[PDB]
Design a protein around this ligand. Structure first.
Ligand SMILES: *C[C@@](*)(O)[C@H](CCCNC(N)=[NH2+])NC(=O)CNC(=O)[C@@H](N)CCC(=O)O
Ligand SMILES: [Ca+2]
Lengths: 235, 51
């Protein structure tokens, strides 16, 4: 996250970090005690990955961290149907053992398709992560967060040569300087509705980070909430 | 549900007689006033409890 601020411990208790052959390579969000939602481009291979919930400072110990192994990965079935488009950039991760919910380890809410879109259109959401704090720069030690405004479709269409699908939305500032970035993918875009946060996007792609005239591109979660609910059932 | 979400804290659905029915997401219960959403579990989704 470029141009954001340090989170407080427990401010985003649904945020997780993913670790693998690279540490802190992507983010995710807690769906429930057994399931994380992230970006499919983070988990393309099926190399072994771990998830850390209750994370705040990735170089220190808070004694709130819960580490789990990933035992199943479900990329959306249409991801990579078309090469290099980032369409349907969303995946689910099943954990080996359930997280223990507490003030530092709490799920994000997920509304139906209609209300997820309603919440997105309120037009202001928060993104968070341990990604780069400058384009081509170093990653964050302390979890970063940033409020980003929704950008109208025509504006976003003109900002890039790459295709913006209906399954995506754009967010960020006309003047640049503030954006999600590499390492943040898979983390949440959330909308707070009277003190209750709902998942409205997945951090997905962009052209560089925080450049003026460019915007962050996000997976539009409203289009996938039925699939998320179907696959993450607990029994 | 047209204005201010029918005063539902979370979800609104239009019923009949121009009335409205509120509802809540998993982990919450529709409160007594039939508009607000109250937590039904120790750590309901989407809320900061560390303070
Ligand atoms: C995988 C995930 O960490 C990143 C998120 C980048 C979000 N970028 C902005 N400006 N909000 N996703 C990618 O790196 C996917 N590939 C791209 O975005 C490429 N267009 C650029 C890759 C690069 O500059 O390293
Ligand atoms: Ca730590």
């Amino acid at each position: 996250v470029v141009g954001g601020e340090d989170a407080k411990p427990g401010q985003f208790p649904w945020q997780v970090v993913l670790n693998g052959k690279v540490d802190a390579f992507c983010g995710g969000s807690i769906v429930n005690e057994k399931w994380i939602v992230t970006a499919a481009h983070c988990v393309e291979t099926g190399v072994k990955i771990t998830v850390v919930a209750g994370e705040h400072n990735i170089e220190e110990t808070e004694h709130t961290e819960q580490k789990r192994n990933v035992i199943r990965i479900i990329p959306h079935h249409n991801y990579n149907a078309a090469i290099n488009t980032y369409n349907h950039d969303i995946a689910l991760l099943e954990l080996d053992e359930p997280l223990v919910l507490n003030s530092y380890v709490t799920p994000i809410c997920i509304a139906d398709k209609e209300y997820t879109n309603i919440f997105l259109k309120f037009g202001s959401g928060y993104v968070s992560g341990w990604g780069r704090v400058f384009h081509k720069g170093r990653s964050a030690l302390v979890l970063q967060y940033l409020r980003v405004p929704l950008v109208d479709r025509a504006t976003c269409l003109r900002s890039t040569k790459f295709t913006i699908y209906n399954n995506m939305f754009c967010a960020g500032f006309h003047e640049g300087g503030r954006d999600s970035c590499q390492g943040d993918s898979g983390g949440p875009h959330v909308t707070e509705v009277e003190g209750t946060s709902f998942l409205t996007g997945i951090i997905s792609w962009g052209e560089e980070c925080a450049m003026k005239g460019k915007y962050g591109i996000y997976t539009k979660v409203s289009r996938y909430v039925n699939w998320i609910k179907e696959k993450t059932k607990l029994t | 549900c047209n204005i201010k979400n029918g005063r539902c804290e979370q979800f609104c659905k239009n019923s009949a007689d121009n009335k409205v029915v509120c509802s809540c997401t998993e982990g919450y219960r529709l409160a007594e006033n039939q508009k607000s959403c109250e937590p039904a579990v120790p750590f309901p989704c989407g809320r900061v409890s560390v303070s």
